[PDB]
Enzyme design. Structure first.
Site, PDB file in Angstrom:
ATOM      1  N   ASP A   6       0.829  -1.207   0.000  1.00 45.99           N
ATOM      2  CA  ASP A   6       0.000   0.000   0.000  1.00 45.99           C
ATOM      3  C   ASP A   6       0.872   1.270   0.000  1.00 45.99           C
ATOM      4  OD1 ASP A   6      -2.168   1.855   0.487  1.00 45.99           O
ATOM      5  OD2 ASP A   6      -1.922   1.568   2.643  1.00 45.99           O
ATOM      6  N   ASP A  23      -2.276  -0.682   5.851  1.00 47.13           N
ATOM      7  CA  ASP A  23      -2.584  -0.251   7.233  1.00 47.13           C
ATOM      8  C   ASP A  23      -4.092  -0.179   7.521  1.00 47.13           C
ATOM      9  OD1 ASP A  23      -2.465   2.035   5.477  1.00 47.13           O
ATOM     10  OD2 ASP A  23      -2.396   3.376   7.194  1.00 47.13           O
TER      11      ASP A  23
END
Ligand SMILES: [Cl-]
Ligand SMILES: [Cl-]
Ligand SMILES: [Mg+2]
Length: 205
Positions: free
Chosen positions: A11, A175
């Site tokens: 990410d 996250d």
């Protein structure tokens, strides 16, 4: 790693680049968007914000939209500056890490982002010594180019399909808990770093 992991999906926000919602808000008030909070919430994006994230509108349209909501002429680059102040830095030890990971894994980026932000990180965050964004990733999968966004199941399928990789051989670091939970359904293995976590411990012998 031990799990037959050959591929990493990484990410961008939080996991690589530090973000600063407050600074972005303040800079937007400064240029005269007093109700920026009413309209903007990166935790739950709406309107033009959601639209730009899936590439349903161009940056130009994003800026008119912003101008319209402000009821005031503010230059493209003033708008871009406030919007880009959301982004802070990718610490160079993360870039080193991505470069190191190339020795053992094929490494991809999967990110919900938009054209303005992407151009900024390509210009300002990824260049490092001799390296550029292409040096770190086999490919970068971006929501606004794919016309889909995490955590839609279809985005994780489009990635493994496009890349020609097996989900069970793939490890995803994001996250966002919901993003990871959806990826797990496809058999992708995941890890959810905390804010500011140095997640390089995932790779230690
Ligand atoms: Cl740094
Ligand atoms: Cl994202
Ligand atoms: Mg993130």
């Amino acid at each position: 790693f031990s799990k037959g992991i050959k591929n990493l999906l990484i990410d961008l926000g939080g996991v690589l680049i530090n973000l600063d919602r407050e600074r972005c808000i303040e800079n937007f008030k400064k240029i005269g968007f007093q109700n920026i909070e009413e309209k903007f919430c990166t935790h739950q994006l709406d309107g033009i914000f959601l639209q730009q994230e899936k590439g349903l509108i161009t940056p130009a349209e994003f800026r008119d939209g912003i101008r319209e909501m402000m009821g005031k002429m503010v230059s493209d680059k003033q708008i871009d500056a406030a919007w880009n102040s959301f982004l802070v830095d990718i610490p160079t030890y993360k870039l080193d890490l991505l470069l190191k990971l190339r020795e053992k894994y094929v490494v991809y980026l999967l990110s919900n982002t938009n054209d303005i932000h992407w151009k900024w990180v390509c210009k300002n965050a990824f260049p490092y010594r001799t390296f550029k964004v292409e040096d770190y990733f086999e490919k970068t999968y971006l929501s606004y180019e794919m016309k889909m966004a995490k955590p839609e199941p279809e985005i994780f399928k489009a990635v493994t399909e496009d890349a020609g990789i097996d989900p069970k051989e793939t490890f995803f670091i994001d996250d966002s808990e919901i993003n990871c939970k959806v990826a797990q359904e496809l058999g992708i293995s995941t890890y959810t770093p905390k804010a500011g976590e140095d997640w390089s411990h995932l790779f230690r012998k």
